[PDB]
Amino acid sequence: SVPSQKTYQGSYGFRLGFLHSGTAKSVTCTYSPALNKLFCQLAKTCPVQLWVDSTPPPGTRVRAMAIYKQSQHMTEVVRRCPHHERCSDSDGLAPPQHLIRVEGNLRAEYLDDRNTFRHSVVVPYEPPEVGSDCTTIHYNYMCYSSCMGGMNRRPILTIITLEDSSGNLLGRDSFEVRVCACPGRDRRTEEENLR
Ligand SMILES: [Zn+2]
C-alpha cells in the first residue's frame, strides 16, 4: 500500500509554512512555492512551520514520512542508502536507517511500521510560544537524492500529518524534497525550467 498524500486542512485548519531563504549559492535549505519543493543540503537544518486556525487537543502529534513521488516506485520504502545507514552518525535516538530526523526534540519518536515497514518520525504538537504565531519543527534529511542503492536520483515527497493520540488523521500536507549539494542553484534551475 501507499500513504495518502492528499492535502487536508481538517477541523483545525492545519497547513505548513516555509521560511524565505533565497537562492544564493551558499544557502543550505530553500523552499520553492511554485514547485512545492524543498531543496536542502545533506543533514542540514530544515525549518518547517506548522500553522493552525485553532489549537488542537493536548496529545496531538505531528508525523513526518517520505514516499517516492513516482507511482512506479511508490510501494518501495524510502530509506537511507547502504553507505549512510552504516556511517555511525546516529544522534542516539534516530535509527541509522531513517532518512528523516527531527533536531533538538527529546520527545521525538521513530517508528518502523510493523505492517508496511515504512519509517516515520513523530513529535508532540506544541502550541506557538509567546510572541509566535506558529510552531517550528527542525528536520534533517540524511541522504542525498542521488545516493546509489538508496533514493537513487528518484524524487521523494515528505508527508506531514497532524494526528490525534491514537494516530488518527486530523490534517495533512506535503511537499517534494531534493537533497543536493547546491540547493540555491538547483532551485533556480528548476523554477526556470518551469517557465
Ligand atoms: Zn546516502
Swiss-Prot record:
Give the recorded effect for E76A.
Answer: In a sporadic cancer; somatic mutation
Taxonomic classification: Eukaryota, Metazoa, Chordata, Craniata, Vertebrata
**Impact of changing I100T on the protein?**
In sporadic cancers; somatic mutation
Q: What is the effect of changing R63H?
A: In LFS; germline mutation and in sporadic cancers; somatic mutation
Q: What is the effect of changing G171R?
A: In sporadic cancers; somatic mutation
The entry's stated outcome for P155A is: In sporadic cancers; somatic mutation
Outcome of mutating R80S: In sporadic cancers; somatic mutation
**Span covered, complete protein:** 96 to 290 of 393
Q: What is the effect of changing N193K?
A: In sporadic cancers; somatic mutation
Record-given protein name: Cellular tumor antigen p53
Species of provenance: Homo sapiens (Human)
Q: What is the effect of changing Y110C?
A: In sporadic cancers; somatic mutation
Phenotype when changing P155N: In sporadic cancers; somatic mutation; requires 2 nucleotide substitutions
Q: Which gene encodes it?
A: TP53
